[PDB]
Write a protein that binds this ligand. Structure first.
Ligand SMILES: Nc1ncnc2c1ncn2[C@@H]1O[C@H](COP(=O)(O)OP(=O)(O)OP(=O)(O)O)[C@@H](O)[C@H]1O
Ligand SMILES: Nc1ncnc2c1ncn2[C@@H]1O[C@H](COP(=O)(O)OP(=O)(O)OP(=O)(O)O)[C@@H](O)[C@H]1O
Ligand SMILES: Cc1cn([C@H]2C[C@H](O)[C@@H](COP(=O)(O)OP(=O)(O)OP(=O)(O)O)O2)c(=O)[nH]c1=O
Ligand SMILES: Cc1cn([C@H]2C[C@H](O)[C@@H](COP(=O)(O)OP(=O)(O)OP(=O)(O)O)O2)c(=O)[nH]c1=O
Ligand SMILES: Nc1ncnc2c1ncn2[C@@H]1O[C@H](COP(=O)(O)OP(=O)(O)O)[C@@H](O)[C@H]1O
Ligand SMILES: Nc1ncnc2c1ncn2[C@@H]1O[C@H](COP(=O)(O)OP(=O)(O)O)[C@@H](O)[C@H]1O
Ligand SMILES: [Mg+2]
Ligand SMILES: [Mg+2]
Lengths: 680, 680
């Protein structure tokens, strides 16, 4: 058993009662000098390294060719100038086991951390050598982390798609179902996670033409999708809670389910308008609807109408077919299923669209895997083979997360947010998906990105602030207001520079101006002195700066229809020495076994004299955690991946009280603690 | 219990030992006077009937509008002039329960047998009132029976496709698999039976791009197809026996199969070149091949190359990957599976293509459900969404069967064959399938039809000839030679009249002339005096008439790439008072229960003094039955649906001896005794 593993397990052998947290600095030193350093191919020079990597199909050629090799050498030297040392064993382990380029035979390391960062920065900068240096520092300071699809692939031959997160609308016809099956498979062969809105399909037992009682309904299309995802080497289906098939749709995921209905590779999510929550609160018997009878009567997809305005009219219209259900028992059933499987992802639709900027394009109708992406969409119609299709707007999103601790310690909220936006914008412009025409069309027209944040708990706990305190909410209120400020500002700058906006920008609340109402009348500077000191050295936007930005946006518009969303962070959390996303930590010390050995990872920064501040999530009050997320969500234009952390000692009514409280506080999406393609 | 059922069961109460065969004439009289006649809507006049049926969406309007109502009345009167009486209870039962148009609420009969026949004849004739009368007599004399898709639908609103039999090629890409899934579903929603050739898909464990060992293989695509056929309200997959996946492909249909592999709605068929039979005879270890390694090496689909010429070259080529198998044990496994499920359909490919007329278009590579359709085909390539597709040639076939007994007693081999061809040609020209571009293209280009025959055993047994005798083979040799003669003659006539041929006709053996070699040098007039007397009154073509037809075809060409094939006959066998297809009968008297009552159907014509001639199939020598089919097959340009009738007392080696003997005699396809869409 290796020496680095030796020192690693010595953390758990207590000294003066204390753990041996410093042993892990030894373990990662041992892991390099006695292993990594000896399986890293080392070349006589960089040109020899790069020439080898281009000539052997490891790297791509075009992006490097945009630079003079004297400039490529300066960029690499910038990365190595940091003298970056991993502070823990598992952080270095996760980079070399999951991200570092290895040889085709997988026996030696071709990339150090500085090499992958230099290649990504050379790709983002697209010829601008100084910008590449700017990107190298931002990544080697660990201020920004592009998503794993982007961070892993950039500059590689045999490179997978930089974007791996997709959402699809499906129209109510056999042509459209067949095309969604193929798009699902085409995106999935590229490694994408695909989420499909099934709310427009007609329900079980609806007419086809004049044959009554002929439709298989939503579950039939889930069976076909489940199979498509099996064949092509993970997907999701969303359903509106007022769809008649909602119960059958949920039942496909009971672990006890029969195999006549069992769907096994599909996540599910449920979309809940306000009208449902009112009906469940009132314990009033509610109706769910056969969507095609609504279509034949109103000429519109039920999915495209406002259920808060239309519910009573649908109930009274005799040509609309409906079914009675118990809303409380359905709500309880959602709590049960989430205990089984984490999902169904719950989306509070009116909490999304109350503050949505682009309802003019459409209401937000569904979300992606782990449910942080919230964008407008319009269904296509794929017509008969001899006829022209009508291409709508699907959704794809390009993700990255800034690292809150290093952004605060570098006092670089503005510079990081603007640079990371530039990088996400470059990934969006170099994407061309084939065989998914509405994804391709929406990416050019909407130009949407998703910048997030990680290390919230880590940063708070290392500055003596409990995750559940009002001080923590006061830090989050200001920090994410500032992120949003410079994000909007950089998007308007790019709009002025390029002279374009996203298509139909002028219909958005950014153009009509009401997006800015709370920012020009309410101050978001800290209410607590100790929190305000954290921001010393950085200007905090006032209502006057917001007024001038409102005016700026009014003149130049905006390049991006959406900018911010907080995805989960996977393995890369280790590499960044960062607590996952904006969630509280789950364990103070993780014990995981790898190859007949046990490894220990204490939370980034865990010391004996801050132990109290790394409070484990399952011991926290979820009603206070909801308060924190609702605070961040004010300043995030899309969504926040939000897992509740619950003891099995929770009654089904305690669970629904959390649900109702989340809804009350304006939370957009929620589930309980397969998303791999849609995580940073 | 009704009176017709009363008299019906009295057949089985013996008199002087004899059965009471005449009771069934009473039973069908009782069934009319005491039931059918009282649930038939009767109108004051025909115009009142027709106007009702057009105004209430029962009938279509366009085809009737091509006639003056004075002519529609003459055609109907022609049908009723026959005074057609069903000779048995079950024959009338099957027409009114399965074919006669009932009201939308299914409570009364809108069509007598004379009405359905008049409507079909008005449709076939397409305005030619005299031709409609010709069609009415041919159908009411029960000389010709169009297939159930055609006979049931013609002239109806909400009418299904007249053709319901389709065969598809599938190319080796995800694009093509997705398109085959959609075509399968589009054809299947129209009621079609769909057969797909899977021999071009690469095998389990082949490369995708440069990822080695990445393919799911043929079984993965069967799982998706199985699901497509489930969703859309029966299909078949064919595989060449030299495909590496052959064993896994067969195993999906073991009744004991695991549900990780179980395919439940798909028939299967196996395509066997001569080289395999030689290898199994020699008990020599044989190889099966990974098709993509052959493609990467030879630039051609293994499916498109001649395995008899290429086998040894494939084995020696080191860049071709193969696997060893035991051919005898594989042959035995085919016998086992056919005992379980009737299928896999076996196709002896070189027996098909030795005599195929259009190898210039392609070799025949596979067949349909119940395996009588044998036509050339060329695979499409459905490319990326933004790119043009390359449309090949799929197959669809329009079926009908003449009724041998009534054709002989009317001495009308020529008139029936030529008229039935006209009708099948009209169904082909009025088909336009959407969402299946290679089916649509091949139907216009190939103009293929499939005219068959029924009542072979019935006719033989009623003329004192045993199905297994050399006299019976001598009658079949002549009768089907004459069918083929007038079929080719009428196709050449239509070619002269229209001035067209099927596309690329001049490459066929009809054009180069060698199709006719045996007919200009061998005489097919009867060798037995008693058989020759059966043909008295009809001219039997001589080698001189064949020489003049050869010359005729040479000048005018041919309209149809294929003309003859003998499908099974389903329920319509009852309506025609006919033994099924060209098969021997299975039971002298069928006992079936319907609605708490037992019904008896003696074979059409079964009398006590011909009992010996209605020998039951399971008591016959299958080696003699093979001899009969091989005799008919000489004069049929496509195939003959051929079920072996076997006792469970057959060793697995007895079964393979039949297989080898069928192959020896030139049989094209065979299986053991779901085809509903591809039966007359
Ligand atoms: N395998 C490798 N071998 C050598 N340098 C590498 C390799 N991988 C990355 N580099 C980086 O390339 C940069 C330039 O490397 P190189 O060895 O060519 O120059 P040097 O000898 O250090 O300095 P100079 O180019 O001024 O002589 C350095 O920052 C080095 O860390
Ligand atoms: N429901 C029906 N009522 C009447 N005739 C029908 C009906 N269905 C079919 N027919 C057929 O329509 C044909 C013409 O029928 P119709 O009753 O109009 O004429 P008719 O009185 O028998 O003779 P004519 O037209 O010379 O007076 C007949 O052959 C009849 O069998
Ligand atoms: C063909 C078919 C469709 N469907 C579903 C798919 C769609 O959600 C829905 C409608 O299919 P469509 O393909 O739109 O049918 P249609 O256009 O012929 O008829 P209509 O005018 O009523 O739309 O029915 C089935 O459930 N089973 C089937 O076999
Ligand atoms: C994408 C994909 C294809 N396949 C099968 C379908 C086809 O039979 C075969 C090839 O798929 P293709 O779609 O043709 O793949 P490709 O063109 O990218 O690669 P190549 O040049 O090697 O053709 O692989 C799978 O088995 N699983 C998959 O996930
Ligand atoms: N924690 C670490 N993170 C990254 N690289 C490391 C780490 N520890 C050791 N290495 C690598 O191993 C080399 C040998 O380590 P060492 O000689 O102890 O440090 P230094 O070179 O700073 O004196 C370092 O130069 C470095 O490239
Ligand atoms: N075997 C049968 N096949 C068809 N129709 C029949 C049959 N038996 C009776 N019918 C119908 O019932 C009617 C009443 O029968 P019946 O009066 O016995 O015969 P007919 O009218 O020839 O004297 C017939 O006109 C005929 O339309
Ligand atoms: Mg439709
Ligand atoms: Mg390919």
């Amino acid at each position: 058993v290796p020496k680095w593993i030796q020192l690693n397990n010595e953390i758990m052998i207590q000294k003066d009662g204390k753990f041996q947290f410093d042993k892990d600095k030894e373990a990662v030193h041992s892991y390099f000098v006695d292993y990594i350093n000896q399986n890293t191919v080392f070349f006589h020079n960089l040109k020899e390294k790069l020439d080898y990597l281009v000539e052997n199909q490891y790297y791509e050629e075009e992006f490097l060719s945009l630079y003079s090799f004297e400039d490529i050498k300066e960029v690499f030297k910038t990365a190595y100038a940091k003298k970056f040392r991993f502070p823990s064993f598992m952080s270095a382990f996760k980079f070399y086991n999951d991200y570092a380029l290895k040889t085709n035979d997988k026996k030696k390391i071709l990339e150090r951390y500085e090499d992958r960062i230099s290649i990504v920065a050379l790709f983002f900068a697209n010829g601008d050598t100084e910008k590449a240096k700017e990107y190298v520092n931002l990544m080697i300071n660990q201020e920004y982390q592009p998503s794993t699809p982007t961070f892993l692939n950039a500059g590689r031959k045999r490179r997978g798609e930089l974007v791996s997160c997709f959402l699809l609308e499906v129209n109510d016809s056999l042509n459209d179902i067949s095309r969604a099956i193929d798009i699902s498979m085409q995106l999935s062969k590229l490694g994408g996670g695909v989420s499909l809105n099934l709310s427009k399909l007609r329900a079980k037992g609806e007419a086809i033409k004049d044959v009554e009682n002929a439709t298989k309904g939503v579950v039939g299309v889930m069976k076909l999708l489940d199979n498509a995802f099996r064949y092509a080497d993970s997907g999701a289906a969303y359903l509106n809670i007022f769809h008649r098939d909602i119960n059958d749709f949920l039942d496909t995921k009971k672990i006890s389910a029969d195999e006549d209905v069992r769907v096994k590779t599909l996540s599910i999510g449920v979309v809940i308008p306000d009208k449902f929550v009112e009906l469940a609160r009132e314990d009033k018997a509610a109706y769910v609807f056969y969507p095609h009878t609504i279509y034949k009567e109103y000429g519109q997809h039920m999915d495209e109408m406002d259920m808060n305005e239309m519910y009573d009219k649908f109930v009274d219209n005799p040509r609309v077919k409906k079914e009675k259900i118990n809303p409380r028992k359905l709500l309880e059933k959602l709590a049960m299923l989430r205990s089984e499987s984490g999902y169904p992802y719950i989306m509070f639709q009116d909490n999304v669209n109350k503050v949505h900027a682009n309802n003019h394009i459409s209401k937000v109708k569904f979300s992606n895997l782990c449910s942080e992406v919230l964008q407008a969409s319009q269904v296509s119609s794929y017509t008969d083979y001899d006829e022209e299709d009508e291409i709508g707007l699907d959704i794809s999103c390009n993700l990255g997360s800034l690292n809150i601790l290093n952004v605060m310690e570098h006092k670089s909220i503005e510079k990081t947010v603007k640079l990371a936006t530039d990088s996400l914008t470059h990934v969006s412009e170099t994407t061309d998906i084939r065989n998914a025409p509405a994804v391709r069309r929406a990416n050019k027209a909407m130009k949407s990105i998703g910048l997030g944040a990680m290390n919230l708990h880590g940063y708070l706990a290392q500055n003596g602030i409990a995750y559940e305190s009002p001080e923590a909410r006061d830090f989050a209120n200001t920090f994410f207001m500032m992120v949003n400020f410079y994000s909007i500002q950089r998007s308007a700058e790019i709009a002025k520079e390029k002279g374009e906006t996203f298509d139909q920008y002028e219909g958005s609340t950014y153009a009509t101006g009401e997006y800015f109402d709370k920012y020009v009348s309410t101050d978001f500077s800290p209410k607590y002195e100790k929190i305000a000191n954290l921001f010393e050295g950085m200007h905090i936007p006032t209502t006057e700066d917001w007024k001038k930005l409102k005016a700026f946006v009014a003149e130049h518009g905006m390049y991006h229809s959406y900018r911010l969303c907080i995805a989960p962070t996977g393995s890369i959390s280790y590499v960044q020495s960062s607590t996952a996303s904006v969630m509280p930590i789950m364990e103070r010390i993780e014990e995981r076994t790898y190859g007949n050995s046990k490894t220990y990872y204490p939370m980034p920064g865990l010391a004996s004299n801050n132990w109290f501040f790394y409070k484990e999530a399952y011991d926290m009050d979820m009603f206070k955690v909801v308060d924190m997320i609702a605070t961040i969500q004010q300043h995030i234009d899309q969504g926040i991946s939000f897992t509740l952390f619950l003891k099995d000692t929770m009654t089904t009514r305690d669970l629904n009280r959390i649900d109702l409280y989340a809804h009350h506080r304006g939370i957009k999406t929620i589930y309980y603690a397969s998303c791999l393609s849609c995580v940073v």
